[PDB]
Amino acid sequence: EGVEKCIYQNNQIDLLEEYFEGETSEHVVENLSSKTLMLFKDEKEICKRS
Amino acid sequence: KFDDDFYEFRSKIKELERRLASVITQGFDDYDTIYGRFKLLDNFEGLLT
Amino acid sequence: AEIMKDHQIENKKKKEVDQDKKQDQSMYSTSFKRCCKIMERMVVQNDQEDKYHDYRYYWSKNEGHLLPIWRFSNEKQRKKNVTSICWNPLYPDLFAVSLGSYDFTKQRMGLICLYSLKNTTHPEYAFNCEAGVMCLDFHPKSAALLAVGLYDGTVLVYDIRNKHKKPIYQSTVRNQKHTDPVWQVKWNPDTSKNYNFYSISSDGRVMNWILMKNKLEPEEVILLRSTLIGLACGLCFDFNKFEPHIFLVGTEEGKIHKCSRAYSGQYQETYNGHLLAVYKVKWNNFHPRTFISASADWTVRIWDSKYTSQIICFDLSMMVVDAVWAPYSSTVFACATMDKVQVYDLNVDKLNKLAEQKIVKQPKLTNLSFNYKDPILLVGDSHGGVTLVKLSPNLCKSGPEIKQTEDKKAMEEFKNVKIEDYEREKMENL
Amino acid sequence: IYKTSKEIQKSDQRIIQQRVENSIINNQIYQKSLKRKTSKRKVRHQANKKNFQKEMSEVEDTLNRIKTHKTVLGYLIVNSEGGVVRGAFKDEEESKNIANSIPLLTKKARSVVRDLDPTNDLVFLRIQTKLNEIMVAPDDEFSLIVIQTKG
Incomplete structure (x- = not known):
């Protein structure tokens, strides 16, 4: 009877469950981005050269 | 009896036409260019109900 | 350990970088957090x-008994009204109530x-918003x-x-976000076209939102649209589970309109029965072309889509705030008015309410919601306190004879059949 | 200019510390800890700094809430090596006795669970005495023990 009483209290709610455990954010908006890595330019050329 | 069928058929054509108006309007907004929208009109040129 | 050495596949991670810092807050973070939460x-x-034991099985002839079990509220959030309430489809235990501010x-x-x-x-998850949240909904496919x-x-x-808790997506002027307030927001069940978001604004423009990558696309399903100035105001909208194309949208004017996704500029049907704005319109469960609407005028009316007038009208002296159908059985609904919540079963009583209760004496009830998994009703007070009341076992489906005819089909078919029989009786009276 | 140079240096230091923080709100406990470790050249100031010694409300906030909850004598965290990371009891003798006696029982209790099934590991253990209820949550890094009088 005492063992049965303990069984009923635990049965009502799991109490250890973690909502959305493990699964990550999944889709997450990403902004497209551009990063200049370096600039190459001629030095002291007459006028300018395209 | 045929006339009664025609009225039922008349409603079906209107339902078909109403759906076409919605899809046609969505396509026109989607192209976003005068040339693109015009091309869609040429395809449905003989499909106007 | 020797077996792991024998087979070097997926070497254990969780490298011991840990938290460190020596003093002023070493560790106290992810495995330890789970233990603290437990x-x-x-x-x-x-x-x-004592309360938990009663909640699991207190077990509550035409009588109804409702008992409030717990009340969830915040002193800081006391100004905020309960407004919209929703339950996650994946977990029955998790339900989210978004506080909003009424009175304009x-x-x-x-x-x-x-x-x-x-x-x-205290709340499992806390979210801060610039303005009060009028409506909160959960996608059925993903909790x-x-x-x-x-x-x-x-x-x-x-x-x-997401741990950060910032909004995944937002609506802007460039995204054609509607003006005034979006009273009703719902998630489309179909996931073929990514994720579909349905929102009804106070201005009255049904908006369909499709989730994209770092962008949201809005499509107007219909316009509310008579010698009047401006678009009709809509306070609520609902989609029939049986047919996706037909959706019912409530209006401030007081006329409920049945709408079809295919025709943006056309109305399938219009109901003029209500004399005041309808706060909530919901299709009855287990049946098609039937719904219950709660309006500002203190009357609750049940309508048939084929008919142009409400089949049954219920009169309550206190103003009706909202009416919700019971998920477990058809012809069961709950209406909460001026601190009084009433549940009606058509089979148990033709007009008299089966049960009337007042979960919280001090505050008016902003809204009420129904849980699909168990017979528990959530009631939201004006102060933001949310109290769940478990319904009595007196009301149940297939009640003339217990376990009679052993029909598995009857749970989703006899309930549909029972409303039709009840509906036929109303036609004979009128 | 020497003062100016110093100022510049300070600024540079500040920038390095930020990076991930990116200024704005005071934010984060983890970020602060990292900065202190790696570079100790500059500290404090920068922005509002929120509440001092409060990097994260959530584990710290939850522990404060359970202690504040009615009918709870206190919650004492036991270090994996028989130590008191944090003690919250009215009398030191009860806390000192709880700090050494309770972990030994849990380790013995964990083995009892362990003998029946090797794969199974202790997740939570609760011992109920005639006048008090003892709840102990065991993790390899830390152990949480809470004593709550039965209602």
């Missing part, structure tokens, strides 16, 4: 053991709180996706999984 629930469980003239920030059944002391509607028509998409 410990908080266990301490709460021992104190609430007074406007304050609204906090969205998800209250897990395991811990009632994490959340739809939020706020003042100035802003549409907010939130993911429960």
Whole structure:
């Protein structure tokens, strides 16, 4: 009877469950981005050269 | 009896036409260019109900 | 350990970088956090053991008994009204209530709180919003996706999984976000076209939102649209589960309109029965072409889609705030008016309410929601306190004879058959 | 200019510390800890700083809430090596006795669970005495023990 009483209290709610455990954010908006890595330019050329 | 069928058929054509108006309007907004929208009109040129 | 050495596949991770820092807050973070979370629930469980034992099985002839079990509220959030309430499809225990500010003239920030059944002391998830959240909804396919509607028509998409808690998506002037307030927001069940978001603004423009990558695309399903100035105001909208194309939208004017997704500019049918704005319109469960609408005028009316007038009208002296159908059985609904909540079963009584209760004496009830998994009703007070009341076992489906004819089909068919028989009786009377 | 140079240096230091923080709100406990470790050249100021010694409300906030909860004598964290990371009890003798006696029982209790099934590991253990209820949550890094009088 005492063992049965303990069984009923635990049965009502799991109490250890973690909502959305493990699964990550999944889709997450990403902004497209551009990063200049370096600039190459001629030095002291007459006028300018395209 | 045929006339009664025609009225039922008349409603079906209107339902078909109403759906076409919605899809046609969505396509026109989607192209976003005068040339693109015009091309869609040429395809449905003989499909106007 | 020797077996792991024999087979060097997927070497154990969780490298011991840990937290360190020597003093002023070493460790106290992810495995330890789970133990602390479990410990908080266990301490709460021992104190609430008498209440928890009653909740699991207190077990509550035409009589109805409703008992409030727990009330969840915040002193800081007391100004905020309960407004929209929703339950996650994946977990019955997790339900989220988004606080909103009513009365129009007074406007304050609204906090969205998800209250897990395991811990009632404080919300499992807390969200801060610039304006009060008018409506909150959860996608059926994925529990994490959340739809939020706020003042100035802003549409907010939130993911429960994300730790940061910032809105996943937002609606802007370039995204054609609607003006005024989006009273009703819902998640489309179909996932073929990514994720579909349905929002009804106070201005009255049904908006369909499709989730994209770092962008949201809005499509107007219909326009509310008579010698009047401007578009008709719509306070609520609902989609029939049986047929996706047919959706019912309520209006401030007081005329409920049945709408079809295929015809943007056409109305399938219009109902002129209500004399005041209808706060909520919902299709009855287990049946098609039937729904219950709650309006500002204090009357509750049940209508048939084929008919142009409400089949049954219920008169309550207190103004009706909302009416919700029972998920477990058809012809069962709950209406909460001026601190009084009433549940009506057509089979049990033709007109008289089966049960009337007042969960909280001090505050008026902003809204009420129904749980599909168990017979528990959530009632939201004006102060933001949310109390869940478990319904009595007196009302149940297939009640003439217990376990008679052994029809598995009858649970989803006899309930559909029973409303038709009840509906036929109303036609004979009129 | 020497003062100017110094100022510049300070600024540079500040920038390095930020990076991930990116200024704005005071934010984060983890970020602060990292900065202190790696570079100790500059500290404090920068922005509002929120509440002092409060990097994260959530584990710290939850522990404060359970202690504040009615009918709870206190919650004492036990270090994996028989140590008191944090003690919250009215009398030191009860806390000192709890700090050494309770972990030994849990380790013995964990083995009892362990003998029946090797794969199974202790997740939570609760011992209920005639006048008090003892709840202990065991993890390899830390152990949480809470004593709550039965209602």
